[PDB]
Design a protein around this nucleic acid. Structure first.
Ligand SMILES: [Mg+2]
Ligand SMILES: [Mg+2]
Ligand SMILES: [Mg+2]
Ligand SMILES: [Mg+2]
Ligand SMILES: [Mg+2]
Ligand SMILES: [Mg+2]
Ligand SMILES: [Mg+2]
Ligand SMILES: [Mg+2]
Ligand SMILES: [Mg+2]
Ligand SMILES: [Mg+2]
Ligand SMILES: [Mg+2]
Ligand SMILES: [Mg+2]
Ligand SMILES: [Mg+2]
Ligand SMILES: [Mg+2]
Ligand SMILES: [Mg+2]
Ligand SMILES: [Mg+2]
Ligand SMILES: [Mg+2]
Ligand SMILES: [Mg+2]
Ligand SMILES: [Mg+2]
Ligand SMILES: [Mg+2]
Ligand SMILES: [Mg+2]
Ligand SMILES: [Mg+2]
Ligand SMILES: [Mg+2]
Ligand SMILES: [Mg+2]
Ligand SMILES: [Mg+2]
Ligand SMILES: [Mg+2]
Ligand SMILES: [Mg+2]
Ligand SMILES: [Mg+2]
Ligand SMILES: [Mg+2]
Ligand SMILES: [Mg+2]
Ligand SMILES: [Mg+2]
Ligand SMILES: [Mg+2]
Ligand SMILES: [Mg+2]
Lengths: 133, 146, 94
RNA sequence: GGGUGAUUAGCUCAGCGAGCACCUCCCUUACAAGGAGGGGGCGGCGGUUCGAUCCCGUCAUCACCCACCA
RNA sequence: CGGGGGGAACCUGGGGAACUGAAACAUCUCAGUACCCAGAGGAGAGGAAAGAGAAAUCGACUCCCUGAGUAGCGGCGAGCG
RNA sequence: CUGGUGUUGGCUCUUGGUCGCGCCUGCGUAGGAUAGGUGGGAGCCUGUGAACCCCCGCCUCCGGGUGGGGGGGAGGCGCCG
RNA sequence: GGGGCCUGACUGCGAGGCCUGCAAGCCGAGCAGGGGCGAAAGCCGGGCCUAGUGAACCGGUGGUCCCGUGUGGAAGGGCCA
């Protein structure tokens, strides 16, 4: 890689599990990008994609504005916006969409579901965050 | 199983270290070869009681030296030698420097361990060093007559 | 004498019960006994030889109590006697 | 009631389309052996993707060692 | 200094059947009986709650009456309790 | 007869599982001839010796894939096609 | 024998009897609920009838919510199938 996140990886730690509100505020400072940062935080899920009965879909737009689908490998992705929103508001938006997921969580789906959510951007790292606290 | 090593045993470490090894090793090798003992309420007590004993004898030696260090780090001895001009007819041996210090200033010294090589054959001002373990510079003045 | 010289453990009588069938807890009709007969269980009895004062003292002990012999070994006061010195290291206080 | 294995054109197999066959054709002189061509054919559907005899629940039979049976 | 061996039955501990009953028989019964062994004594055992068990209760152990052929146990059989 | 385990220890080489993270990995003309999945995302990495180069390595679906080092020193460039 | 519409191959019961050592087996009008066919009277609690079957124990499975070992639950049982 470059020195983009080799300047930035000694301040942000993947090893020791973290929670949202303390690890939420660093998402715009962790991206050294030149342009237009669109943050994406994600976790994979414990449902077997090999059966379509357990899949999940929809379109639910976020309150704040532009600026959910599971794959066949069983992870989850979604855009939360554009550069736009600041660092301290996302404790409000970092628990926002994350509670729209579990709405359509399947019943015959087996296992702990939000597994490892790593707060990231298009431009950014692996850092542990709790889905809840 | 807890054993107190009686001898540095190399991977399973140093003397008096409390190491945990399998009972079979303990009972059929270490113990009967006098290589260790069971670490018990007693044998561990005797150990700690004797880690204190030594760390007293040592820490009262470093507080022995430095306690008679400052005596002769300040106090000075001057020894008149049968004159010559900046050459001594005799010398002053390390032995001699002892004898002086006893006679004037009343301290006692072994007297090995300053500089034994070259028993010093010239007049001048010298700074000589002492022992055991952290230690002293001393000041000897040599001049003339008796 | 298959009896631990330290703990006192000695052989006991136990029944051997042959059962057939499927536990009720598994939804079987439940288990049936096709035989019961007497057997024994011996203590797990081992030699431990240890050197004490002059001599070699060997105990017959249930492997559970093997440590007790070395505790008993520490216990060193004034015995110049024969290999029947063990009556002294046998137990004293306990 | 298990482990699950045997899943396959007409018969058997192999892949998370071949041999003994059958037909025309050579070779002998002839069974032959060979040598060359032709022949819907994959336990079962719903569903997966670009594609899927080459991805997943019912269960359709199949053995071997197995469970149990008032 | 003590032990050893004996003692009708009684006692505790170590071991421990079968006939029989189950109208056959194996789990079950008989039965922890008979018997063998060890050890107590004039008794032995037990005994001073890591107990009961539903009352905010009782209060060591032993023995009798009762609780009660109850609660249960049981090829839910015989029967055990 | 036999698995596990106790009695049962020292030193080694050797492997499987699985977990964590690091690391690579994969070809149905095509997009530009070498697309693992899928939503983002309109570029960027780059001098902390790029564009290539050479020796030296690893996997090789081999045109190709890929890192260590230096000869390396101011471009390659994403959608756009 | 043919056609149309249906599922009474009902649920809650059952006067009275046939048979009969017991246990069983058999027939059964009628009332209640909600239905089917019928304009209706009415019929319908399987089949023209008489064989097509198996006490109890133990256990499976669905259900009700009855019991739930100090109490709330739970384990397990009961009851209906
Ligand atoms: Mg057994
Ligand atoms: Mg039974
Ligand atoms: Mg018997
Ligand atoms: Mg031994
Ligand atoms: Mg043990
Ligand atoms: Mg004790
Ligand atoms: Mg007895
Ligand atoms: Mg009998
Ligand atoms: Mg008999
Ligand atoms: Mg009988
Ligand atoms: Mg009889
Ligand atoms: Mg008979
Ligand atoms: Mg009995
Ligand atoms: Mg007796
Ligand atoms: Mg007697
Ligand atoms: Mg009397
Ligand atoms: Mg009396
Ligand atoms: Mg008495
Ligand atoms: Mg009894
Ligand atoms: Mg490993
Ligand atoms: Mg009647
Ligand atoms: Mg009758
Ligand atoms: Mg009627
Ligand atoms: Mg009516
Ligand atoms: Mg009508
Ligand atoms: Mg009517
Ligand atoms: Mg019976
Ligand atoms: Mg029953
Ligand atoms: Mg209830
Ligand atoms: Mg309760
Ligand atoms: Mg209740
Ligand atoms: Mg209770
Ligand atoms: Mg129930």
């Amino acid at each position: 890689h470059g020195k983009r996140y080799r300047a930035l990886l000694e301040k942000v730690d993947p090893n020791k599990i973290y929670t949202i509100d303390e690890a939420a505020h660093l998402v715009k400072e962790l991206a050294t990008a030149k342009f237009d940062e669109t943050v994406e935080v994600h976790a994979k899920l414990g449902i077997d994609p090999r059966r379509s009965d357990q899949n999940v879909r929809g379109t639910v737009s976020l309150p704040h504005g532009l600026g959910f689908r599971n794959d066949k490998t069983g992870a989850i992705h979604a855009p939360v916006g554009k550069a736009s929103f600041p660092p301290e508001k996302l404790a409000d938006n970092i628990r926002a969409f994350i509670r729209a997921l579990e709405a359509h969580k399947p019943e015959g789906a087996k296992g702990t579901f939000l597994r490892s959510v790593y707060v990231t951007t298009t431009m950014g790292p692996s850092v542990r965050i709790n889905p809840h606290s | 199983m807890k054993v107190i090593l009686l001898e540095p045993l190399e991977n399973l470490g140093d003397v008096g270290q409390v190491v945990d090894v399998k009972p079979g090793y303990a009972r059929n090798y270490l113990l009967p070869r006098g290589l260790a003992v069971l670490a018990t309420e007693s044998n561990l007590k005797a150990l700690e009681a004797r880690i204190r004993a030594q760390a007293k004898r040592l820490a009262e030696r470093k507080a022995e030296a430095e306690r008679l260090k400052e005596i002769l780090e300040n106090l000075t001895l001057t020894i008149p030698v049968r004159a010559g001009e900046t050459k001594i007819y005799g010398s002053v041996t390390a032995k001699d420097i002892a004898e002086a210090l006893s006679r004037q200033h009343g301290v006692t010294i072994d007297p090995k361990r300053l500089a034994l090589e070259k028993p010093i054959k010239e007049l001048g001002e010298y700074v000589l060093t002492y022992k055991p373990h952290p230690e002293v510079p001393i000041q000897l003045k040599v001049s003339v007559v008796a | 004498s298959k009896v631990c010289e330290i703990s006192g453990k000695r052989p006991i009588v136990a029944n051997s019960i042959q059962r057939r069938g499927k536990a009720k807890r598994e939804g079987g009709v439940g288990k049936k006994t096709t035989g019961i007969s007497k057997r024994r269980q011996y203590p797990n009895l081992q030699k431990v030889r240890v050197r004490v004062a002059g001599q070699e003292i060997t105990f017959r002990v249930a492997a559970s109590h093997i440590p007790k012999v070395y505790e008993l070994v520490e216990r060193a006061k004034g015995l110049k006697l024969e290999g029947l010195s063990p009556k002294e290291i046998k137990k004293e206080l306990l």
